[PDB]
Amino acid sequence: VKESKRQFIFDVVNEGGESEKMEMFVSFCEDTIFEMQIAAQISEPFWGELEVQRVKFLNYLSRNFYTLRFLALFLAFAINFILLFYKVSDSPPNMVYYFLEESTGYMEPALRCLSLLHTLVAFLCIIGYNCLKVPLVIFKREKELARKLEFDGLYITEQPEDDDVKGQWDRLVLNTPSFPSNYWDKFVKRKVLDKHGDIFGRERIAELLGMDLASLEITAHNERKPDPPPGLLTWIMSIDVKYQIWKFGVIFTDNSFLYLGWYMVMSLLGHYNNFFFAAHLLDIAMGVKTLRTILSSVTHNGKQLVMTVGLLAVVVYLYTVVAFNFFRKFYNKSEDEDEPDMKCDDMMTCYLFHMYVGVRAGGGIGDEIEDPAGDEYELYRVVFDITFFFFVIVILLAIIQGLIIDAFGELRDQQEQVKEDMETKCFICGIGSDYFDTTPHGFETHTLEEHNLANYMFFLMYLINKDETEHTGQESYVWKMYQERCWDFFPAGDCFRKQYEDQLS
Amino acid sequence: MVMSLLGHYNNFFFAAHLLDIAMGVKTLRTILSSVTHNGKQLVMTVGLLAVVVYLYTVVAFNFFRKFYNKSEDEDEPDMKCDDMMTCYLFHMYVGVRAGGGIGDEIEDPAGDEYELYRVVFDITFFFFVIVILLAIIQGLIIDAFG
Amino acid sequence: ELRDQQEQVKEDMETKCFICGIGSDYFDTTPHGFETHTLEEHNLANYM
Amino acid sequence: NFLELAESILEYFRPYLGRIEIMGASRRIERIYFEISETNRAQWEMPQ
């Protein structure tokens, strides 16, 4: 929860607007409450016994999801260390033989054991993710969909944009019997019907949301408790195929799940050829935090880097055109005078030669083409080579390096800005420290005892847990504002000390 | 003091005391703080470079073994990628130090059925190992200064 | 320097009224005061 | 009470009620209300 809080604070301070700050804060509180419920559920203490064991096993996997990921990383490193001993031969230990060359004779069985263990651990990581993180993904998707239905009439008054793939896919879940499965609000359909029913048609809304108007009054009329046995037939009857399809689409579109799935696929391939296990070494980027931060420097300006490489390609093409039209005689790469090897007698070969050799050469294409001294075009050739060296080797590569350096600087600036904002301003009311520090340790007192965001989260939890008939006046006021999604109760630019400055003085 | 005593055993051990300038001179200490400020990031970057070079070594060992002959004598070839350990050492020792990457030091691919594969191999090695990772190191140092 | 120019423009627009020049700090004494001021009181689009 | 009863009219004319502030002949800041035409708003919102 602390890591989630830090990530949320960073996101709000960097990519956030003061107008939506409180909306995002309340959304974070909702997500944190759901995550707390998941953590409590997985916390440690024939069909019935099997269910008990299955639940315990899944809870164990969810609890040790990260330990399993680290174990997978370790197993990949061990497998690759073993692979370092591979050798190739033309005879068994014209087709070639690959075999480990080690004295002990134990590495190969160790390799088999480690490969099997790695595949098993990858599978367990997928299961642990599906049990620990997917619930929050579905919760967020359902919450967003419900809000867009009730307060925006997304599929009633408006429509998706024909390119909002998420909006188009969410159309599959609207009429499912179990749409709000993770999101807490189980009456979103009733609320939407009551809100947009009259202007859009109650029957039309009921068809859109898959509601049975007639029976929905009966439900309120009396209490019906069914008696479903553990029968697999009953479980099949309970399965909601359309909702399951929508959920699987969401999951298979989620990035982390796809990453883990491709990890598992790569392990299975490693069983086919052990060298496929090398792909799992790239896992360090996702695993280690320091490496992830370092790689963010490259990926921050990735679009600019790709565009720079494209510009380099275009410039090299222009140089290739000039060479192909004027300097063809200098591109002979064969010492044998009998059989010349001209590298610029056709544009494709000349372009490949330039891009492959001149770009990698320390001094450009002049290092690798014939010396121009004594030729009628000597000055033209030296200008050609010098300009190639200065534009392609000195400047464009300098552009790439400068992009990386600027990425480093900008990321550090973002971190410093977040730190300074948190240390010089209240996250809730926005008043600066300077005002509060007129009293000794005033800012610290204010942010720890008066406007603590943790205290606001705790208040939301307390309101949810308390009975409504027991709410005080202020609790009822805040509860009504929460239900209406009005964030006016949050103090903005004001505080108790400001309100009672003279009385408190 | 131990190093001085050793210098009495062999006079060349007295060279170790030249490193004392880092602690002694203030300007040099400040300059070296630029390197040491992001030392963890520099070490992690070197590790990432090792991993990337290992991946390139795996690809070369499986596909481009014929290009890694470093012997002119046709009688006695010297293949540098007929075993993974030798290929990895060759890559990390020669390709990283080469100005244009491993393509500078392996055999020319022109005329081979895998020519385009080889040029993609060499160009990507040059751009990822020589241009970007070393640029990451230099940028870390510059950011430390700033 | 180019990144600094972009950031400076963004910060100036988000921390000060383009017309009167008063800073956000003053307006934000009222809830969402700066947003209200720049959308409903001193909107340059409204001047056009 | 009148504003609550006129909520619908105010909501309907919200996009067309231009509001600015000027330093008037009285040496005081004055609020000015005027009509924004639909064509004017559309042309202003054109991407160019």
Ligand SMILES: CCCCCCCC/C=C\CCCCCCCC(=O)OC[C@H](COP(=O)(O)OCC[N+](C)(C)C)OC(=O)CCCCCCC/C=C\CCCCCCCC
């Ligand atoms: C997607 C970009 C590349 C991803 C890396 C690997 C490709 C994985 C993915 C997808 C397409 C595969 C579909 C075909 C599957 C069959 C595999 C195959 O066709 O098997 C050919 C050779 C292995 O030979 P074999 O079948 O005779 O084995 C002995 C088995 N017997 C004796 C029974 C014949 O395949 C080999 O060479 C395996 C070892 C060398 C290949 C490089 C893998 C590890 C090296 C570096 C890390 C991965 C590269 C990182 C790239 C990141 C940028 C995207």
Ligand SMILES: CCCCCCCC/C=C\CCCCCCCC(=O)OC[C@H](COP(=O)(O)OCC[N+](C)(C)C)OC(=O)CCCCCCC/C=C\CCCCCCCC
């Ligand atoms: C932005 C980075 C990309 C730029 C790449 C180039 C930068 C560095 C370049 C070049 C310096 C060498 C200039 C080219 C050599 C000209 C030699 C010359 O002048 O000999 C007069 C020629 C010979 O006559 P011919 O009938 O036998 O050959 C033409 C008939 N054919 C083509 C069918 C054989 O007659 C003629 O073509 C008259 C001239 C034709 C029109 C001028 C076009 C020449 C090409 C490039 C000029 C721009 C580069 C200079 C700017 C440098 C700063 C970046």
Ligand SMILES: CCCCCCCC/C=C\CCCCCCCC(=O)OC[C@H](COP(=O)(O)OCC[N+](C)(C)C)OC(=O)CCCCCCC/C=C\CCCCCCCC
């Ligand atoms: C800890 C990392 C390396 C530290 C540098 C030196 C090692 C010091 C430390 C510890 C372990 C030593 C334990 C064994 C002590 C015996 C020394 C030894 O076994 O003596 C072998 C040779 C000297 O030959 P000798 O005995 O025949 O002398 C003639 C004497 N008679 C004629 C009687 C035979 O030792 C030689 O080569 C001495 C001269 C060359 C060795 C380099 C020393 C100075 C060069 C550069 C600065 C130091 C390197 C900076 C590294 C910083 C990164 C950590």
Ligand SMILES: CCCCCCCC/C=C\CCCCCCCC(=O)OC[C@H](COP(=O)(O)OCC[N+](C)(C)C)OC(=O)CCCCCCC/C=C\CCCCCCCC
């Ligand atoms: C992140 C930085 C690290 C990445 C390092 C690599 C980056 C630059 C790399 C490479 C371009 C060359 C691609 C590899 C050459 C493939 C040649 C080919 O395609 O000939 C089809 C082969 C020949 O069949 P065979 O049975 O005789 O040889 C397999 C049996 N054995 C291994 C036992 C001999 O059949 C096959 O293996 C079918 C293909 C096997 C599955 C694909 C795996 C190939 C290896 C790497 C692909 C990823 C690099 C491309 C991405 C570049 C952007 C970074």
Ligand SMILES: Nc1ncnc2c1ncn2[C@@H]1O[C@H](COP(=O)(O)OP(=O)(O)OP(=O)(O)O)[C@@H](O)[C@H]1O
């Ligand atoms: N409304 C606010 N509520 C809480 N902290 C605030 C608020 N406004 C500003 N801050 C500042 O945010 C920082 C919060 O400290 P911090 O997150 O380190 O505390 P913590 O509970 O020990 O958690 P952690 O150790 O996980 O970071 C402090 O500088 C506090 O002054």
Ligand SMILES: Nc1ncnc2c1ncn2[C@@H]1O[C@H](COP(=O)(O)OP(=O)(O)OP(=O)(O)O)[C@@H](O)[C@H]1O
């Ligand atoms: N006098 C002002 N008039 C308008 N915006 C102002 C003024 N002073 C400051 N601003 C700020 O300038 C920014 C204007 O927002 P912005 O230009 O993004 O709005 P827009 O109408 O949606 O246009 P666009 O999406 O094309 O940028 C807001 O941060 C607003 O607070």
Ligand SMILES: CCC(C)(C)C(=O)O[C@H]1C[C@@H](C)C=C2C=C[C@H](C)[C@H](CC[C@@H]3C[C@@H](O)CC(=O)O3)[C@H]21
């Ligand atoms: C085994 C270790 C991993 C990191 C999964 C891997 O192999 O990744 C690369 C490298 C190469 C060796 C082989 C690959 C095979 C197929 C896909 C494209 C995969 C990337 C996974 C995508 C992209 C991610 O960014 C997030 C996401 O959703 O899935 C890719």
Ligand SMILES: CCC(C)(C)C(=O)O[C@H]1C[C@@H](C)C=C2C=C[C@H](C)[C@H](CC[C@@H]3C[C@@H](O)CC(=O)O3)[C@H]21
């Ligand atoms: C007159 C003295 C020199 C030195 C030629 C001059 O002024 O510039 C040089 C050097 C540098 C300063 C700038 C230059 C860039 C482009 C032009 C074309 C020129 C090359 C002259 C061509 C090359 C051959 O065709 C022979 C010939 O006479 O014409 C060159």
Ligand SMILES: CCC(C)(C)C(=O)O[C@H]1C[C@@H](C)C=C2C=C[C@H](C)[C@H](CC[C@@H]3C[C@@H](O)CC(=O)O3)[C@H]21
């Ligand atoms: C079709 C025209 C070319 C030029 C091949 C193309 O499209 O891409 C090239 C150049 C560049 C743009 C991108 C590429 C990266 C990877 C692929 C595999 C490809 C190599 C094609 C392989 C090599 C040999 O096996 C021969 C063969 O036919 O297949 C290459």
Ligand SMILES: Cn1c(=O)c2c(ncn2C)n(C)c1=O
């Ligand atoms: C606003 N809100 C919630 O945020 C909430 C809730 N139950 C759980 N959460 C998380 N209830 C009933 C609720 O009204």
Ligand SMILES: [Ca+2]
């Ligand atoms: Ca009561």
Ligand SMILES: [Zn+2]
């Ligand atoms: Zn406050």
Ligand SMILES: [Zn+2]
């Ligand atoms: Zn103003």
